[PDB]
Amino acid sequence: PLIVPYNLPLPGGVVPRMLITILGTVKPNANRIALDFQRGNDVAFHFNPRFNENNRRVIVCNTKLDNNWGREERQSVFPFESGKPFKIQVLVEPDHFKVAVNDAHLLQYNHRVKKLNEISKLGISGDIDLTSASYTMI
Ligand SMILES: CC(=O)N[C@@H]1[C@@H](O)[C@H](O[C@@H]2O[C@H](CO)[C@H](O)[C@H](O)[C@H]2O)[C@@H](CO)O[C@H]1O
Ligand SMILES: [Br-]
Ligand SMILES: [Br-]
Ligand SMILES: [Cl-]
C-alpha cells in the first residue's frame, strides 16, 4: 500500500497522450477524495469527489492560481461508493484532462493552466486506501 497523502512526481510535466492511473479503495463513511495536479503552488486541475455536500454527492473540479480558487465545474454523476475499490484514469488530451472511473468516461476539464510541461506533481489525498499510482504513454 502507498501512504496518503501521496505525491506522484510527473517528470517534465504532462503532455498529451500521458495516462495517469490511480487504483484505490474508498474508506467506509468517506467524506472526500482529491487529486491535485500542481504547477508549483498553483493547482492546474483539482478533481474532488465530495460524499456529503448538503446531503448530495458531487464531484467539484477547479483550478487554484496565486492561492485563489477559480470558477467551479460540477459533475453530479458520481461513480464512487464508500467501501469499494475504484480505478481513476486521467488522460491528457490537447485541450483537456479526460477522466474515466472504472472504465467509464466521467468528465473532461478544459486546460486553464497552459504550461502543461510545468504541471509536474500529482497529489492524491482523501478518504481512501491507495493501492497504485502510475503513468504511461498511450
Ligand atoms: C456551493 C459553493 O459555492 N461551495 C464552495 C466550496 O466548493 C468551496 O470549497 C473549496 O472548493 C475548492 C474547489 O473549488 C476546493 O475543493 C477547496 O478544498 C474547498 O475548500 C468554498 C471555499 O472556497 O466556497 C464555497 O462557496
Ligand atoms: Br481559474
Ligand atoms: Br489526506
Ligand atoms: Cl499558464
Swiss-Prot record:
Q: What is this protein called?
A: Galectin-3
List where the motif Nuclear export signal lies: 114-129
Binding residues for a beta-D-galactoside, per the UniProt record?
A: W69, G70, R71, E72, E73, R74, Q75
- Tissue expression summary: A major expression is found in the colonic epithelium. It is also abundant in the activated macrophages. Expressed in fetal membranes.
Covered part of the full sequence, start to end and full length, is: 113 to 250 of 250
Keywords assigned by UniProt?
A: Acetylation, Cytoplasm, Differentiation, Disulfide bond, IgE-binding protein, Immunity, Innate immunity, Lectin, mRNA processing, mRNA splicing, Nucleus, Phosphoprotein, Repeat, Secreted, Spliceosome
Q: What is known about what this protein does? A: Galactose-specific lectin which binds IgE. May mediate with the alpha-3, beta-1 integrin the stimulation by CSPG4 of endothelial cells migration. Together with DMBT1, required for terminal differentiation of columnar epithelial cells during early embryogenesis. In the nucleus: acts as a pre-mRNA splicing factor. Involved in acute inflammatory responses including neutrophil activation and adhesion, chemoattraction of monocytes macrophages, opsonization of apoptotic neutrophils, and activation of mast cells.
Question: A Gene Ontology biological process annotation?
Answer: mononuclear cell migration
Query: Record's Gene Ontology CC terms?
Result: cell surface; collagen-containing extracellular matrix; cytoplasm; cytosol; extracellular exosome; extracellular region; extracellular space; ficolin-1-rich granule membrane
User: Where does the record say this protein resides?
Assistant: Cytoplasm; Nucleus; Secreted
Species assigned in the record: Homo sapiens (Human)
**Top-level taxon of the source organism:** Eukaryota
Query: How does the record describe its quaternary structure?
Result: Probably forms homo- or heterodimers. Interacts with DMBT1. Interacts with CD6 and ALCAM. Forms a complex with the ITGA3, ITGB1 and CSPG4. Interacts with LGALS3BP, LYPD3, ZFTRAF1 and UACA. Interacts with TRIM16; this interaction mediates autophagy of damage endomembranes. Interacts with cargo receptor TMED10; the interaction mediates the translocation from the cytoplasm into the ERGIC (endoplasmic reticulum-Golgi intermediate compartment) and thereby secretion.
Give a GO molecular function annotation for the protein. Answer: laminin binding
Q: Where in the numbering of this chain does the Galectin domain appear?
A: 6-136
* Entry-annotated residues carrying Phosphoserine: S76
Q: What is its main location?
A: cytoplasm
